[PDB]
Amino acid sequence: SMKIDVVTIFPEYLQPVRQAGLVDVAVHDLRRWTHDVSVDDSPYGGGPGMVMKPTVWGDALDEICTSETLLVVPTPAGYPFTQETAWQWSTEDHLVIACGRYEGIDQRVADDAATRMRVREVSIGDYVLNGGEAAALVIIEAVLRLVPGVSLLEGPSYTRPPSWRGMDVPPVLLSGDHAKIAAWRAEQSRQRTIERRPDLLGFDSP
Amino acid sequence: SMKIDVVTIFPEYLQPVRQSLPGKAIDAGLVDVAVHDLRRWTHDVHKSVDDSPYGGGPGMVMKPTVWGDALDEICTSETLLVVPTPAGYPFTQETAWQWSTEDHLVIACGRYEGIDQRVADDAATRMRVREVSIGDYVLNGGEAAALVIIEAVLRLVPGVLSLLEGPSYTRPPSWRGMDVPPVLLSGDHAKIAAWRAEQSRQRTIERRPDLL
Ligand SMILES: COc1ccc(Cn2ccc3ccc(-c4cc(N)[nH]n4)cc32)cc1
Ligand SMILES: COc1ccc(Cn2ccc3ccc(-c4cc(N)[nH]n4)cc32)cc1
Structure with missing residues (x-):
């Protein structure tokens, strides 16, 4: 309350x-x-x-x-x-x-x-x-x-349709392989955090 | 525009x-x-x-x-x-x-x-x-x-x-037992600027050490 x-x-x-x-x-x-x-x-x-x-x-x-x-x-x-x-x-x-x-x-x-x-x-x-x-x-x-x-930044999200304007949803997200999906999302988040918020990982800001 | x-x-x-x-x-x-x-x-x-x-x-x-x-x-x-x-x-x-x-x-x-x-x-x-x-x-x-x-x-x-802005004051000169810092009423504008600079430095150290 x-x-x-x-x-x-x-x-x-x-x-x-x-x-x-x-x-x-x-x-x-x-x-x-x-x-x-x-x-x-x-x-x-x-x-x-x-x-x-x-x-x-x-x-x-x-x-x-x-x-x-x-x-x-x-x-x-x-x-x-x-x-x-x-x-x-x-x-x-x-x-x-x-x-x-x-x-x-x-x-x-x-x-x-x-x-x-x-x-x-x-x-x-x-x-x-x-x-x-x-x-x-x-x-x-x-x-x-x-x-x-x-912490770390959220990676990209997608929803239907699987192909839109010739842009395809990353195939791993359609695979139903939870471990492979978790790994790809981790890599995406890492990539995004380094690029946009390197301070969050203890690196110098641009 | x-x-x-x-x-x-x-x-x-x-x-x-x-x-x-x-x-x-x-x-x-x-x-x-x-x-x-x-x-x-x-x-x-x-x-x-x-x-x-x-x-x-x-x-x-x-x-x-x-x-x-x-x-x-x-x-x-x-x-x-x-x-x-x-x-x-x-x-x-x-x-x-x-x-x-x-x-x-x-x-x-x-x-x-x-x-x-x-x-x-x-x-x-x-x-x-x-x-x-x-x-x-x-x-x-x-x-x-x-x-x-x-x-x-x-x-x-x-x-x-850079540095954070320090405290600001206006009327009345005394309120609930708290006086405006006398330096601000001194008419020594070089001293006032230096006081404000030091307030800024102190506040930045305390609140935003990342800016230093
Ligand atoms: C899974 O991670 C999340 C993903 C989205 C959300 C909520 N949400 C949805 C759209 C949207 C747009 C901006 C913001 C926002 C921006 C800042 N600096 N804080 N929050 C938040 C937003 C929550 C969590
Ligand atoms: C002399 O420095 C200035 C002091 C205040 C202002 C405008 N202003 C007046 C009240 C007020 C309350 C909050 C904020 C604010 C907070 C954040 N993170 N950005 N802006 C801004 C505010 C302009 C300049």
Whole structure:
């Protein structure tokens, strides 16, 4: 049984989550916790863009989080989110995902939170998004498919027809020889991993 | 001026991307994102998109005949065909920069165990094809990856949307007992830059030693 709360100034962007019982996902508009008739301001020390104010975040997380909560904060500067992370988080009772926008969230939000709950700043990959929402969708998908009750690269897969546009399915896959099929698939996976992800086998990246 | 076509059995998944686009960029003809239901190209009354894997094993494989027809209609020789897959080359910021100047991206979103390999291999005989992974975790299908790729690419298209960055701060100067680092309020901008550099170095050592 898992509860996921997602906090964002763009709740509309989290709608793809509908595409249950073991898990509940709830999306909260951060602006719900503002008192004035702005969630951001210029950075101390200077620099381009805006930083999200800690005040609004503090009030939201105060209401949503408990000491048992795992607070997840997507950020390009985070620890890497990997399959290992997904397995680890798959047995959590309560994930709260704080989605930033602009140039990110005042660092004190995570620091304050860490005084009463576990906090994980994470990156989903070495590219830059406009905000945390797409990363939340990735994290939710990767985690939920591992929830109870729900290395090397995978090689190529094939299905019918056995010949298509003059391209034939590798004959071994039609042979019904499980050992020969297992061996060919291993070789394909090895080949693919060396070519595309040599780092996985402890070799230099291109 | 970029056209992005996404092909998926879950077109609703891509709807927020389409709403994420500023009207001014669309009206200026800088960008167009179109989403297509793969089932438009199915052959049968059951609208089948998958079938059992040759050689056996778990799950299902998406049909080459259906995908072949879809890409035949949507792609041209100038298309960059992007195929998310856990077995792909890594998608990075460098990739995003490269793809940001493309006239036409087509993103083919798989589900189940993926797409029959002949689809990409056939397409590669007449257009540029890129199989890519967005990170070292497994998703249920290509749609979330497409969202990530579209966002990362389009935020590099003018006017459409190393070391780690260190912490950032804004008002108020004191909050829940935590003061903004005084150096940031010092007006010594050379010192501030050096402080930020050291914060960056420390964070990179702690979180991403692989970058060093
Ligand atoms: C100053 O450096 C920047 C800091 C933030 C941003 C945009 N942005 C704002 C909030 C936010 C949350 C997560 C992510 C993200 C995470 C990954 N792996 N890629 N992108 C990006 C985010 C741009 C630049
Ligand atoms: C047997 O190995 C598997 C094969 C496919 C799948 C699910 N699936 C189906 C299509 C598809 C497209 C992209 C991705 C993806 C990309 C990244 N970086 N993570 N996950 C995942 C995808 C699961 C496992």
